[PDB]
Structure formats: C-alpha cells, structure tokens
Amino acid sequence: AGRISAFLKNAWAKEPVLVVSFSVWGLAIIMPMISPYTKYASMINKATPYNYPVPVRDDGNMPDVPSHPQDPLGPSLDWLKNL
Amino acid sequence: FYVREPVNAKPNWLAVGLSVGASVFMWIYLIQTHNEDVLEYKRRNGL
Amino acid sequence: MNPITLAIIYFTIFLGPVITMSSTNLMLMWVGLEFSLLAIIPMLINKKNPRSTEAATKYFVTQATASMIILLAIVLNYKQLGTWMFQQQTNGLILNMTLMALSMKLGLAPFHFWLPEVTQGIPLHMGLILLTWQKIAPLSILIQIYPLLNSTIILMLAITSIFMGAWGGLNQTQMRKIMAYSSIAHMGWMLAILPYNPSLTLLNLMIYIILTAPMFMALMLNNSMTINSISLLWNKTPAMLTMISLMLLSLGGLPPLTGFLPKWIIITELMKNNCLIMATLMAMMALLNLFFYTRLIYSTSLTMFPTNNNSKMMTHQTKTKPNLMFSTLAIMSTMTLPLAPQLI
Amino acid sequence: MNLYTVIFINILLSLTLILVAFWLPQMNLYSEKANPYECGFDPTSSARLPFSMKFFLVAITFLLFDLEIALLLPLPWAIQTIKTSTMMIMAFILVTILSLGLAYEWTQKGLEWTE
Amino acid sequence: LKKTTGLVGLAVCDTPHERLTILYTKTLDILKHFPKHAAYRKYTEQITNEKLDMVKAEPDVKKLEALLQGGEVEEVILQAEKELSLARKMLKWKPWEPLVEEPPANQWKWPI
Amino acid sequence: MPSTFFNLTMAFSLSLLGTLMFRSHLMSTLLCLEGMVLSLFIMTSVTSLNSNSMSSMPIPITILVFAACEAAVGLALLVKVSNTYGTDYVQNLNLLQC
Amino acid sequence: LRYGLLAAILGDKTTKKLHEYSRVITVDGNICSGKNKLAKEIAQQLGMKHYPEAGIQYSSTTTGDGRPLDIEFSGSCSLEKFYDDPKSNDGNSYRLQSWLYASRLLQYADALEHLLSTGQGVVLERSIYSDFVFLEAMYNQGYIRKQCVDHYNEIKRLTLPEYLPPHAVIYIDVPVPEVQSRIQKKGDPHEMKVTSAYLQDIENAYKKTFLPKMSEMCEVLVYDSWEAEDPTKVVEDIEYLKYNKGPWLKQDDWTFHYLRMLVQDKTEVLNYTTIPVYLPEITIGAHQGSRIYNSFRELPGRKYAPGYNAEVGDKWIWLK
C-alpha cells in the first residue's frame, strides 16, 4: 500500500521512538511462537534438582532406573549437553 | 400533523418481529418443556 | 467522561461484589470492597462542585478506615489458625471488629452519619448504586459468616438502625436524605436476622432493591430532590402517582403489598428463636417509617400543591421514561404478596 | 552486625565532622545575616505558602507505577519456575496494560503541566 | 498561493480582492458623514479611490503589490481596516473645528 | 514473634486512634492511613515468614498495590478540596448537612 | 435511534460536522431597531437558517399542529395587556418575562440541536443573555418586587452556565427618541403609550452590563442604524472575522455529547425553570391548573404522546 505504508515513513523520520516500542512490543510475543528452542526453557528449568529426589521402594514393578544412578534408564538429558 | 415528526411515525417492524417471534418461541419451548417433562415424570414411579 | 473511562469504571463496579462473591480468601474478598471504592469516586465527582468533593472525601476517609479494620481481622486470623478464612473457632473481637467495620461500610448504628451526607450532594444516578449495589458485597462478607457472629452486638446495631433511620427521616425534606435513612431502617431487618436463617436477609435486599430503584429512577425523571418539587408532579407526569402511592406504602411495609413480607416473615424467624421482646421494638418503629411516607404521598399525590405556570411548558415536550425497569420493578413489587412462598 | 560496624561509623564520620564545624569557626551571628536571602531584599511573603505545583497528575502516575515497578521485581526468580509460559504471557499482560494506561494519559493530556 | 509570510502572527487571510474592497468601499460610506470641506474626507478619498482602482483592475496579487506600495498585501488589509477604525474616531471627535482652542503664550521662541 | 504483634497491633491501633481524632488537616489523616497499612504489611509478612507460608507471600504485595492506589484517589481529592478553598482544612467542608 | 450514546461511538461526532459558518450568531437591539431585516439576510447571505423572536407562543409553534393556542395554555401573559395596564396586582409584568426566558431558552436549546447536527449556524434575535435587559428596565421602574428579581437571576444561575455563549453577538444602537418614533410610526396602540424612560433603561441596561460582560466570552460588532440598513456589510464583517476568546474552542467532542444530551431532553432543559419557589406572581394553585392540564389533554390532538392520536391521524395506534 501507500496510504498506510508511507505513513510509517514520517513516523520513522519524526516520532522515531514509538515505532521501535510498538515494533519491539509486536516483535517480542511473536518470536517465541516461531522458535526452535523455546521448548527447552520449561525443560532446562525442570531438570534442576533443587530439592532431593525421594526414591521409591522396589515392589516388583516399574522397570525404570534401577538402584544405580549411572544406569541407562531414566531421564538422561544428553540434550542440555550438545545443545 | 406534528411539525416535529415523531420518533415513532411508523412501526419499527423489527421490534414487532423481535417481540412477536420471541414470544412464540417461548411458548413452543414452554409447551414442549412441560410435555417433555410430564411424560418424563411418568417413567420414574409409575403413571 | 469518555467511554474508555466509563466502561472501565462500570466494570470495576462489576468486579467488587463479583470478586467478593467468587472468592473464598478474605484477601480477594477484601479487594472486592476496594474496586467498589475506587470506581465510585470518579462518578461521585462528575460536577466537581463543593457538594461532590465533600461527599467523596466523606465517602472515602469514612470507608478506607473500614477496609483496614476489616483487613486487621484477616491478619489477626492469618496468625491464629493460619489460613485466609474465618473458620469456626476464631476469637470474638476479631469478628466483632469485623462486623464493626462492615457496619461502617454499610452504615448502621452511629455509623450512619456519613450515608445521608454522601447520598446528599450527589446525582440521583450514583444515589442508586450506593444503596443497592455497594451494599451487596459487604453482605457477602457477612453471609459467609453465617454462624459465629455475636448475637448481642449484631442486634443492637439493628435497633439502633431502626431508631436512627426513622427518627432522622422525619425532618428531612430532601428525598435523598430520606432514602438514605430508609436504607438504614431496612438494614436492621437485613442485619438482625443474619444468624437466624439469612435466606431472609438475601430476601430483604432483593425486595429493597426493587423498591428504591423505581423511586430514585422516579426522581431522575424530573430531578426533584425536595418535597415541594416531587409535589408538582400531577402537572408534569400525573401517571406516576399510582405507583409511588404503593411504592412507599410498601417500602413502609403494609400487608397487601410485598414490602410487608420481609418485615413479617423476619419477625416469624425472630419469634421462632425466642426473642419475643426485640422484634416488637422494631415493628413499633417501622410505623414511624410510614409517617414521612404518609406525609410524603400527601404532598405528592393526595393534595395538589400549588404549581407554577412556567411548568405549562413541561406539558408540551414529551418525556421518555425507561422501559422494563420501572413497570416491572413497581409491579414485580407491590403486587407479589400472594407469591410469598416462592420468595421463601 | 558487620554492616552496623560500617554505618554507625559513617554517622560518626558525619557527626564528628559537623561538631568540628559549629564549634571551630569563631562566629559573630547578630541579626541580618541569619535572616533569609531573596537576592538582597526583605522577602515579601513568608516563604512557607502554597506552592501550587503543576505536575500533580504525574506524581500520582508515579505513585501508581512504583507499585508496578515493585510488581515486576520478582521476574529474575519467576523465570526459574517450571511453567515459563504463564510467566511469559502474564509478563506481557502487565507491561502491555501499563503502556495502554500510559498511552491513554499521554493522549488525554495528563503529563502536560496544566497552564 | 502564499505559503508562509515573512511576518509573525499576521495570518494569510486568503481571498484578497474582496476584503481590500469591502473595507475601502466602507471607508467611502463612513465618510460622507463628515463635512465636505473637512480635508480629511477630501484627502483619504484620494487615497482609497486610487487603491480601489489598483485592485478593481489588477487581479494578480504579486503585481498588485507593485501598484499599491505596501508589499505583503496582507499588511495592507491590516492598514485598510485601521484607517477605517480611525475615521470613526475622527467622527466622534471634531478635528476640523476652527483654529486652535487656547493658543500658546509665547511658548516656542527657543533660544533662552 | 509474640512480642512484636502485640507491639504492631498496638501500632495499628494508635494509627486507628489517629485517623479518628483529626487536627485540622485532611492530608495528615490520609497520611496516618498509610502507617496503618504498613503495620498490616509487616504483621502479615512475618506470619507468612515464620510459618514459611511462601504461598501466602504474594499477599503482602497485593495488600500494598491497594495502599497507593487508595492513596492516589485520596491525594487526588485534595486537589479538588484545595481548588475550592486552597487551604485544606477539614473544618471547611460542612455544607452537606443542609 | 434517539442518538443515545452508541451513535457517538458508532459515529455521529459533531466536530466532524462543524463548517466554517457553523456559528450560532445572534443580534440584539431595542424594540423597533431592525433585527427583522437583519436576522434574515445574514442567514440567506451566509447559508445557515433563521429563528425569529421567541414570543409568548414559541412552544406552541414547535409542538403538535404548531397553532398558537389559547393564552391560558401558553402562559397567561398577554403582552398587549402589559403596556396598557402595568403594575397590576394580577402579576403579569413578570409572568410575561419568566415565560419568555423559558422560551428564549427553549429556542436556544433547539438551536444547538441543529448547530451540533447537520451543521448550520443559527441566527437568533435577543437570545437568552439579553433577556435581563427588560427586567432591569422593568425593575428600575416600578413593576417588579425585589422578592422576584431574585427568582429570575436564580433561574439564570441554574440554567445559563450549562450552555455556551451566543457566539459573536451583533448590536445596533439607536437613540431612544428615534425608537419611540418608529413605534408611533408603526400603527400599534399597545407598543405606543410606553415610557421613553423604559427605553432609556433598556440601553442603560445594555452598554453598562451586556456588551462589556459579553465582549470577553464572545465577540461584538457594535453598529448603528446606518452602518446597518445595508445588510451585506454586516455579513462581510462576520465572514472575515477571527474567532477566538470563548469556551467554544477549548473543548472536545464529548463536551458536546453531554451538552447535546442536555439539550434534546427538553425536560432537562427546563427542570430548573419550574422550581417550587412559591411567588404569588408565578404560583397559580391547583383548581386553576387542574382545569388547564386536563383541558389541555382534552385538546383535539395532544391527549397522548406526540405519535398516538387517532383524532389527528396516527393510523398505527396499536404497534409503533
């Protein structure tokens, strides 16, 4: 267009502040929606063991991680490394 | 003759169909809702 | 006023109760009293005269102190039995200072001296919001404490609101200071029966809101804030006299009209709970709450005060009264006595 | 305790430096140098009258925002929550309604020095 | 067709050839109430009837300026409505009256 | 903890005892209304901080977003008390009783 | 739609309608000093319309059939009965005047409806603000009590400042021995037999009070009979005029909307004219009024709202 697209041209010459603000506003919410790496923020932040991981007791069930930490089962995050 | 014409010289024909038609929907939903229930009151203890 | 300001302030008003309702925490339930306290003041002050400012200050300072005296009782309760609710075994003066503060939000015993002063010096619109809508959220504090109110001081605040809202309403020519003292009289009925089946105070509120709203809206129609101005109404809109004779003889409860229903079945709940000597002191003084309605419908209806000839123009210019808001609220009251079992 | 050792000092470094300013100048205070200034004349009014500011509305918008600033400050910890999608949105919602609240005042002549 | 005058607070007031004519024609009419022998009426009619002809014949502003000195035409409309305001003052006053009231008492022989 | 809350409850009350006895200023009563809030901030924080009730720690700020928004509406009325009188004395507003 | 508030949001903005000639001009003077060749011919020469003098019977012309009704319905004034017999204990000197204030106000209100929609100017004549001239002329001479002048300036305090000023008033003085001549050369007996002291208190009550207190809120074009009587050069001074110095320019659209809902509701235009200040000149009692209110609704054509009268047409008397 012209009657909208050339209005931005004076608003970029004069008033060259609100254009950045109104852009960075509209450019902030939009980028996490088109990212490859936004999934990890809720995951890198979920891996941190701030509290102690209480172990369950073996009752003939849950073929998960055995009583050994370096055992290939369980949430072995090799994605944080080699990000 | 009302030199300053009334706001209501003609019937606002929407307000008729809004008011007539609404009432006829009320009844038809008020009639069925009773018949639908009395018939359904008669399937819990007896007739 | 600018609609982007109106809608925001007509909506904070819609949040105050609704958050005082849809919230169990006594902190969400507190802020709801404040949304109904911020929002009101911009519309009290629409004229910015020496009557609107003095009311808002007399509405704000009188009513923020109450929001603190409430909030004390939460924190005093947040310590004891740590949570955000008046549970069952909370201390008395926590709640007798809570009920104290609500009585200031509403205006009952000597806490009424701000209500007429504020309900005076104010438009008629925004006289209707205080006495009807600002009153719902404070009661929502006060139905949730269904038991566990001091039956002693909850009841002196009633009688003191029957007296002071009846003795005072006699003097007052300005309708706005009359309806203020009607709110105070009728609250002794809402507030005395609060421990005693408060499905009757939710009633007396929904009745009282149906009585005032036609009245304040019957005064919008000509902006008559004086007996001598509601009098000259047979010349402007004589068609209105048929309701106001009933709107007032009901709002002062006489039996064939619904406004005797709350005053009546309340007393049943009072008699049935062995307080035979209290209800009498009310009902003997609810008759005094007719004398300035008997006298008022005389001056309005049953004797034509001497009008003006400048009022002859008013018999040319075709007003417009609301629709569904007066005819309903004046027949849905004053003619619903036989449907009392449906009410309760 | 370790800070009280820092800061009671600085009061004394100030308080010891002021006592050695009133009791070591050799003063001569009589009448006319104690009286107020106004550039070589006797002041007309009393120096303590209503100023009648003009930025009165902006002082309040600050009074509201100092809360809002305070209402931002827990973001460095909020990112260390496991959700980081309500913290995402609700941080946009707070900053946006602010600018909306700031842009309304910006157009309705709030921060404009009534005159 | 005048964007920005050199002057300040003297707005364009477009549509000249009217106001310059509404005013001069209105001086001629607020004249004719004076005496004919009063020389103010005698002289300012010799002024306006020139300028009125230097507008009633010339439609182009930029050359009209070079006919009635007083360039920046809009500065003339300020003057035309000012003389107009003065004839009214000269009407309620009576300047054409006889030789001076209270002549001077040896008041001006300068060398003392 | 049960030596401050008697001492903070007693600090609330003195401020409640202050914002009911006036001294010819509306702007010292609004002023006494913020120290009233302040004792509730602290007597709420500690209760939420000896009990380790971090889930209630959002509350001592929500109480206080309505300590300034109420002061804001409070301060802004003085602008409309002054512009009638220019003096801000509580004794000067008594023309409602009429 | 009744313009509501939705229409404004939906789009009926008034600044959007304001033309250059969307100016509520007025003209003022004395009782036989132009205004009838001047109010007209400022309208026709500029583009806007013309409201004439609001007599006793303005409200009757804008309502119903527009026919001038009986004197008792439109007041009880009888201007002709004032001149020939003033100072009557049957208060007519003031009934004549409070009724005209109301009708000079309904006139001005009915203008702003039209100024603030389909934007045209309005050419009034002796608008609201030049209505006190008679009273002072009627009070300085003995016709009205001081217990009644207060009733008027009260009403002006309650109705005036809600409205906007007459927006470049016009005036033509004329020496009081001359206006007495135009009356007597105008074959009316009632306007005759008037004191020329009442027409010197008419312009002593103009240039001392009106013209100065209006030359700050609005604009003044003080002319004379000969500067007028050629009504094009009065118009030309209105065209090439530099509008400033008033409340018209320092206010916004939503200042018109709550002035435009103020002015539609004619009941709201007139609430403070009907105040119950019980004066015997203006109080009329019940039996004198109930006889008239009911014998006005018995009129062939009012009887009801302005749209439901089967005796004067109104064919759809049962839906609309």
Ligand SMILES: CCCCCCCCCCCCCCCCCC(=O)OC[C@H](COP(=O)(O)OCCN)OC(=O)CCCCCCCCCCCCCCCCC
């Ligand atoms: C049934 C058992 C249950 C208990 C029943 C209890 C009793 C019923 C309640 C009675 C109280 C209401 C009646 C009192 C109203 C006051 C008097 C009144 O309104 O009339 C006076 C008024 C005079 O005004 P005026 O200017 O002279 O005009 C006269 C004609 N227009 O005249 C008027 O102009 C007013 C009317 C003008 C508009 C026409 C409407 C006529 C009135 C219709 C209402 C009739 C009553 C309804 C039926 C009874 C209900 C049970």
Ligand SMILES: Nc1ncnc2c1ncn2[C@@H]1O[C@H](COP(=O)(O)OP(=O)(O)O)[C@@H](O)[C@H]1O
């Ligand atoms: N209060 C009043 N007292 C006397 N005359 C009045 C009053 N109100 C209106 N009028 C009349 O209004 C008339 C104005 O007449 P004029 O200016 O000649 O023509 P127009 O009626 O068209 O303005 C006068 O006859 C005057 O007497």
